[PDB]
């Protein structure tokens, strides 16, 4: 296309707002860059991945995902077999050629409009229905996907379980949490300290049950849409424009983008921490664990120990009364983790247990984490800003949460940009005020 | 008589204008940017301070600089042919000659460039509110890189022409002068910061108030570089803001002057402030607070808090930052919190 | 009538109401009045607030020993953390005050209204038939106020961290942030400075040039300003004489001549730049700090040669050490 006819070069892709055929190739070709990546990078990870050296200590972020599903791990996330990784990585890398072939094709050779080339695939933005249809399909496609997870858990190998009774290790879920109460509960749980939101979820029964409870809702919707049209309010509510459709889907992603940045930064369950680094609060907790142990195992009586302010170095109480770890860590008294729970009682960290039930596996696990906290520089130099060089490392938990907040944010900006444009392109004035009829010029002055 | 023959030559509408002013602006400007680029990649700051300041040494874009001369130098101009360098260019490089060279050449370079704004303006026939506006930056550089040091012990305490070599100048100030607590710096900020807001709120108001004078979406073309009607609607704008912030412009001529006054004024106050720190005439403390905290040990304000940070910044930094002082602070002296 | 609601919706939407209360404004209005009113009282009178976790209460209000420069509204306690501490969750106001309750009330409310304030900055444009995006330029500051008041704490685990509402405690937030993240050494802040520094630079240029090419329409003894009349027909200065000079200052093509293309560069430079700093604070909120070049440039034997990056770090330690003197019990600052 051209500018003196379409838009502007740096606005190119809008020249396709009405050329579904190409607009399909655009979407296909792209949906190939994602797979390509998923694939090309997993091999890049693997090619460097070292069987027995913490994953988090190797800048991995894809392999960790595959491991959590219960693929090539075994007890404590022991990386038992690399193949599943190689396997997953390549399949994608190939399926990228397929998708890639479609895009290049559909945006060049193929028809640049599905108009007459096929009336079922062709579509009309304002067609407040062919949309509800396409949506419907996809709504079903996602459902099948969700259910796939339940499969990998309840039928094919299970998933990883940090909370594993014996201890971290693959485990086949066979008791998904059914019941709306527990499931939907997480939905209206404050996002604030303590009562987290969705980011709570401390067990795979719920993660699995919750997903089962999704298709049987997500697909239930995929149908309701292929079988109907937006009601009255629905129509007199939204702007039915291609660009406007984008917008809504833009804010959507962005909103989730945060929900994600929060998830990978706080949750221990669906992000093992054996593959990713330790949670931020987790590490601040372990430094106390480490010294409450070192000093006890040295003469100190941690229960009575009183610190510089009068609060007690190792143990103090929380606002609601629970006995927690002392120090700045008083803020992370919400952290719950495998290695620590066995020291917990009904009123909080129990003394007797602490005084003589601290297995070595904890003393060293606690040490591992405090020395692998989520701190580092851009040039990957693990630790506090004032630290010296050596030990280059940055927790996956950091890299992840960091990247996604940027993406997440910019998308909200993006949302406004388009929702604001399409909402005025409709009233129709996104190109300037009509010299001849300036709305303002016909409004009673305020003074 | 030939003066004119020359004047004619100089004032010829070339690609890059020249002018009489250019007979100063370019000899220097280049010569300064040149020295920086040189020192930045080749010369060291080892005999002067005690660090690698160039690329050849291992420094990267952020950590490189043309660091000031030794304190023992004083406020010496460091003329390549002077008592110190004794003509020897290389040593000149080692004692820190490249600093006064950049400082002084850049100085006359800003004098040159302003004369230019004043030469081109006189020719093209426009008001000189751009050479006037540019006084603001002269003030900053002339007081931060020249007056300040002249007030202290040597040149060694002036900024150093380096990215980090500046962040250091920042912290030093916070630590010894407690700058952020100076009303003049505050205005400085209020101006740079709000000058940015004007430069962005105005830009957005114009762009989202444009009349339609084109058919496509990329409305950049709709603007005829040639005269006529305003391109956006001042009337609509004035309305928007007035109902969404109570106050709103309504005199493009005043709006654009404000835009000149705000950021310019603030950098001026910024300057006066530093002219003060040259004599250590800082705004370090509020006595009323000190007297109280001396007597009552339970009085704590974010004020006092910050003052301890300073004590720390000085105690731990001073040593490696002021080598000519041969400081030696035994671990038992270093002020420190608990644990850390 | 015609059912008041129908009518209500017309007033709420009045395009000619002194101040445009909108649908967004229906929230912005009470939210900002709760915040603004609680802030003003908190700042004047209000007991010392146990900011850090310990029991070393800091007083920020005026009636308790401060002046406008030192005073502030102190952040809710560290013992509280990220927990939601509204007034009804206190056993008494005194508890609420001693633990910093005012802060949460004030920021959650300012962030809510300041957002709708962004939304409102669209609604009116729509109601006036003007192009949108102004509200997108304002998403920079908001994004920065969000970072500093909400994102940074969600990362660190507590509202006790996260810039305090006061002039001097703002300097505190900074001087410490540095030592903890070496921010001055982070790309996103440098872009923040290029933005804020740049923005000003151009604000002077635009304002400069234009003023320099106003068309003579006034005597010598009367303001140049009168030469313009509100809403007047055509332009009020020679956008060509302007470029005629600026172009010649540097060189023709190294200049503008398209008001639209020039004015956009004005709203994009500082906005894009300021966005980044917000993304820096939001990024360093999860501990991906600035660059670290400590102990690089090591010499032939292994002696560390120190670059300016080190004098920096040296001054950063001093900060790291003295800050929050009584709040640490162990070696590493992981909170």
């Amino acid at each position: 296309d051209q500018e003196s006819s379409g838009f502007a070069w740096w606005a190119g892709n809008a020249r396709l707002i009405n050329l579904s055929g190409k607009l399909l190739g655009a979407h296909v070709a792209h949906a190939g860059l994602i797979v390509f990546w998923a694939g090309a990078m997993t091999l890049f990870e693997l090619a460097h991945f070292i069987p027995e050296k913490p994953m988090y200590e190797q800048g991995l972020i894809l392999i960790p995902h595959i491991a959590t599903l219960g693929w090539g791990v075994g007890p404590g996330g022991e990386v038992v077999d690399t193949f599943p990784f190689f396997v997953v990585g390549v399949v994608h890398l190939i399926s990228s050629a397929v998708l890639g072939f479609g895009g290049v094709y559909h945006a060049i050779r193929g028809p640049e409009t599905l108009e007459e080339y096929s009336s079922f695939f062709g579509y009309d933005w304002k067609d407040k229905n062919k949309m509800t249809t396409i949506l419907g399909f996809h709504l079903i496609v996602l459902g099948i996907g969700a259910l796939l997870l339940v499969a990998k858990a309840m039928f094919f190998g299970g998933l990883y379980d940090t909370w594993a009774p014996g201890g971290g290790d693959v485990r086949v879920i066979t008791n998904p949490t059914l019941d709306p109460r527990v499931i939907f509960g997480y939905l209206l749980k404050s996002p604030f300290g303590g009562e987290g939101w969705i980011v709570s979820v401390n067990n795979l029964e719920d993660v699995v049950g919750g997903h089962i409870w999704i298709g049987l809702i997500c697909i239930a919707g995929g149908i309701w849409h292929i079988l109907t049209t937006p009601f009255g309010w629905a129509r007199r509510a939204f702007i039915w424009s291609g660009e406007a459709y984008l917008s809504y889907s833009l804010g959507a992603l962005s909103m989730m983008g945060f929900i994600a940045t929060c998830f990978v930064w706080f949750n221990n369950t669906v992000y093992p921490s054996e593959f990713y680094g330790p949670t931020g609060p987790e590490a601040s907790q372990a430094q106390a664990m480490t010294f409450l142990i070192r000093d006890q195992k040295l003469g100190a009586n941690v229960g009575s120990a009183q610190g510089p302010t009068g609060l007690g170095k190792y143990l103090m109480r929380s606002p609601t009364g629970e006995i927690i770890f002392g120090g700045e860590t008083m803020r992370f008294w919400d952290f719950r983790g495998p290695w620590l729970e066995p020291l917990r009682g009904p009123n909080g960290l129990d003394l007797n247990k602490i005084k003589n039930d601290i297995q070595p596996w904890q003393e060293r696990r606690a040490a591992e984490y405090m020395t692998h906290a989520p701190l580092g520089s851009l040039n990957s130099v693990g630790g506090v800003a004032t630290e010296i060089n050596s030990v280059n490392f940055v927790s996956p938990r950091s890299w992840l949460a960091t990247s996604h907040f940027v993406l997440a944010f910019f998308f909200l900006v993006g949302h406004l940009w388009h929702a604001g444009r399409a909402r005025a392109a409709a009233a129709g004035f996104e190109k300037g005020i009509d010299r001849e009829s300036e709305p303002v010029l016909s409004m009673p002055s305020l003074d | 008589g030939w003066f004119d023959i020359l004047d004619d030559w100089l004032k010829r509408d070339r690609f890059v204008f020249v002018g009489w002013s250019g007979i100063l602006l370019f000899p220097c400007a280049y010569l300064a940017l040149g020295g920086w680029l040189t020192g930045t990649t080749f010369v060291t700051s080892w005999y002067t301070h005690g660090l690698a300041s160039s690329y050849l040494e291992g420094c990267n874009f952020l950590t490189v600089a043309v660091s000031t001369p030794a304190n023992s130098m004083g406020h010496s101009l460091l003329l390549l042919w002077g008592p110190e360098a004794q003509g020897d260019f290389t040593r000149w490089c080692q004692l820190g000659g490249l600093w006064t060279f950049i400082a002084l050449h850049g100085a006359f370079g800003l004098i040159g460039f302003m004369l230019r704004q004043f030469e081109i303006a006189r020719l093209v026939g426009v008001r000189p509110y751009n050479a006037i506006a540019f006084s603001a930056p002269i003030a900053v550089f002339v007081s931060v890189f020249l007056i300040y040091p002249l007030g202290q012990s040597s040149w060694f305490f002036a900024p150093s022409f380096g990215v980090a070599a500046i962040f250091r100048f920042l912290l030093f100030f916070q630590g010894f002068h407690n700058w952020t607590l100076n009303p003049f710096h505050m205005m400085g900020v209020a101006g740079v910061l709000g000058g940015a807001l004007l430069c962005a709120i105005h830009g957005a108001t114009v762009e989202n108030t444009l009349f339609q004078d084109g058919e496509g979406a990329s409305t950049f073309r709709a603007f005829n570089p040639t005269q006529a009607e305003e391109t956006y609607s001042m009337v609509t704008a004035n309305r928007f803001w007035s109902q969404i912030f109570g106050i709103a412009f309504s005199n493009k001529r005043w709006l654009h002057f404000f835009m000149l006054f705000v950021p310019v004024t603030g950098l001026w106050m910024s300057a006066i402030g530093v002219v003060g720190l040259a004599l250590n005439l800082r705004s370090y403390d509020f006595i009323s607070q000190e007297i109280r905290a001396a007597e009552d040990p339970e009085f704590e304000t974010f004020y006092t808090k910050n003052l301890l940070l300073n004590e720390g910044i000085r105690a731990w930094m001073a040593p490696q930052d002021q080598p000519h002082e041969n400081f030696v602070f035994p671990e038992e002296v270093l002020p420190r919190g608990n644990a850390l | 009538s015609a059912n008041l609601w129908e009518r209500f919706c017309n007033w709420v939407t009045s395009t000619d109401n002194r101040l445009y209360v909108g649908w967004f404004g229906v929230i912005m209005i009470p939210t900002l009045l709760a915040a603004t009113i609680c802030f003003v009282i908190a700042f004047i009178a209000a007991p010392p607030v146990d900011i850090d976790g310990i029991r070393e209460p800091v007083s920020g209000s005026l009636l308790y020993g401060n002046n406008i420069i030192t005073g502030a509204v102190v952040p809710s306690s560290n013992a509280i953390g990220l927990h939601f501490y509204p007034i009804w969750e206190a056993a008494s106001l005194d508890e609420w005050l001693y633990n910093g309750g005012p802060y949460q009330l004030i920021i959650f409310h300012f962030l809510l209204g300041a957002s709708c304030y962004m939304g409102r900055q669209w609604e009116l444009s729509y109601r006036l038939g003007m192009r949108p995006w102004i509200c997108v330029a304002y998403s920079a500051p908001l994004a920065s106020a969000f970072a500093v008041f909400l994102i940074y704490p969600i990362g660190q685990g507590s509202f006790s961290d996260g810039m305090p509402l006061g002039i001097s405690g703002t300097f505190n937030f900074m001087i410490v942030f540095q030592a903890e993240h070496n921010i001055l050494m982070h790309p996103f802040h440098q872009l923040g400075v290029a933005g804020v520094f740049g923005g000003a630079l151009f604000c002077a240029m635009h304002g400069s040039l234009v003023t320099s090419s106003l068309i003579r329409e006034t005597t010598e003894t009367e303001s140049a300003n009168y030469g313009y009349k509100f809403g007047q027909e055509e332009e009020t200065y020679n956008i060509v004489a302007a470029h005629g000079y600026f172009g010649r200052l540097i060189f023709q093509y190294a200049s503008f001549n398209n008001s639209r293309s020039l004015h956009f560069f004005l709203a994009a430079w500082p906005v894009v730049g300021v966005w980044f700093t917000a993304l820096g604070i939001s990024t360093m909120a999860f501990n991906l700090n600035g660059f670290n070049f400590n102990h690089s440039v090591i010499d032939a034997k292994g002696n560390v040669i120190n670059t300016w990056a080190d004098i920096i770090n040296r001054a950063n330690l001093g900060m790291e050490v003295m800050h929050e003197r009584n709040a640490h019990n162990f070696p590493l600052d992981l909170a």
Binding site: - | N238, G246, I247, S250 | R18, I44, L63, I68, F230
Partner: peptide, 30 residues
Amino acid sequence: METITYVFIFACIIALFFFAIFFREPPRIT
């Protein structure tokens, strides 16, 4: 005595805000 002096200048800015908004010279179209 200071508290009072600070709260005053402030109360003044706030009253000056009212006036600058609801008591300006209306920007009439010329």
